[PDB]
Subunit: 124 residues, 4 copies
């Protein structure tokens, strides 16, 4: 019965925050992503996110992915991971991400993608 | 003058094909992703995708990200890359992807993520 | 003044431990990587590693990469990261890794690579 | 019998070249990596590489990994992949890589790792 659900307010290991609304019945959802550019406490930015969670076998702990469309740069980041209910134990989203920068020349493509992780917990 | 445009029919280096529809003014779009099994010859699965293309500075070669919500498994894949005008004049999407599998215990999280690339060109 | 030094005994966020020996003047080094199975409790496998640490500008927090040649499978893992002095003063290696599995046909290449992270701290 | 062997001279999809010497009986090997920084035809640089190939079940087509210790930067890149003998069909190494940059502050770690691929063919 214990459905790990993406809807709500989350924060992460770098101190960025994220809010995701209601997941409709085809798994779609939208959110906002707020990020720490600086000392962390002054300059904030909001960017939209859009994703889908997988509904195959109505899992507790489904996998999901979403795209963050940076409002302050020409970059795009995509996240994928899984909503786990560890013991008790908050909910926790374990994610991996790819950050695509824009390059002017296709000869620079090879260097345009960063990778990393994010762990998200419910915001308090 | 012409730009690189996600809208249309695409194919890739693995033989999978993808159709993307119109890109609205927020950069959102929807589409379909077809791939195949065995000796790539008969059974074709279709899965929807949703993503966004970065609109910051209305670039001619925009970055973008999308999420593929697999119809036939518990998995999710995210793609991000850039729509280039190649040196030979043809549109190409250079992407990288993260394929997240569903695991059962959070202790298996470590091994749930594959990474790789796809290069898409227009279909005839 | 003290720098961050790969030489020594290390442990990580998954419970695996690693020993690295002396780093010669070319930046080369060797060591051992131990991990475990089931409920992480009894059977420990040991595999050798070899790598190099970047020496350009004799930095105090050098980047490095190493290859783990698994003793118990056909697989290979590579790690790369950086040896930091953390904010709390303790040495930490932040790494990312690519785990390549062996496949049989070149058509399965696409799915042979996992990615993720490990964070190492010194053992007592 | 057809052993895909790392020893030799290779080139890649970006026009970098690589030479690897003899693989000893524990799988170790060393090489040089020559890279195109510019128009491709003028400024060359050589950097050492060191790796191991997996010897578990003496495979044709073993997996391998290696570290390239950049001589002209504080970065490190690691490659992992597999030596395939496709039909006939050259030998071909399909690789993935992680490029670690040096960051001054551990607060920048998250952005320090790029990922991508390289396909290598025997040099002619
Ligand atoms: N992809 C990604 N981007 C991030 C994270 N945190 C963060 O601040 N960013 C911003 C940094 C960069 O300035 C911007 C696009 O260049 O994305 C983050 O965790 N992931
Ligand atoms: N990791 C990696 N690095 C490369 C490749 N090609 C290339 O020229 N480099 C260089 C570029 C960069 O200037 C240097 C270290 O910063 O590594 C490459 O294919 N992979
Ligand atoms: C996240 O939320 C809290 C306020 O509830 C705050 O510490 C911080 O400003 C937020 N982080 C960002 C990047 O805005
Ligand atoms: C992709 O489309 C082409 C039609 O141009 C078709 O020949 C091919 O089999 C398709 N591949 C898949 C997996 O749908
Ligand atoms: C790592 O080392 C510690 C000793 O400090 C031990 O308790 C632990 O079980 C070891 N883990 C493995 C997998 O070797
Ligand atoms: C690779 O080798 C050939 C010469 O055989 C040449 O085209 C090129 O200069 C080499 N590439 C680099 C980066 O040196």
């Amino acid at each position: 019965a214990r459905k790990c659900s993406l809807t709500g307010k989350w924060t992460n290991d770098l101190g960025s925050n994220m809010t995701i609304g209601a997941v409709n019945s085809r798994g779609e959802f939208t959110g906002t992503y707020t990020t720490a550019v600086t000392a962390t406490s002054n300059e904030i930015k909001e960017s939209p996110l859009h994703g889908t969670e997988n509904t195959i076998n109505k899992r507790t702990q489904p996998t999901f992915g979403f795209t963050v469309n940076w409002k302050f740069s020409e970059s795009t980041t995509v996240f994928t991971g899984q909503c786990f209910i560890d013991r008790n134990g908050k909910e926790v989203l374990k994610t991996m991400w790819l950050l695509r920068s824009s390059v002017n020349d296709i000869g620079d493509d090879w260097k345009a993608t960063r990778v990393g992780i994010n762990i998200f917990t419910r915001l308090r």
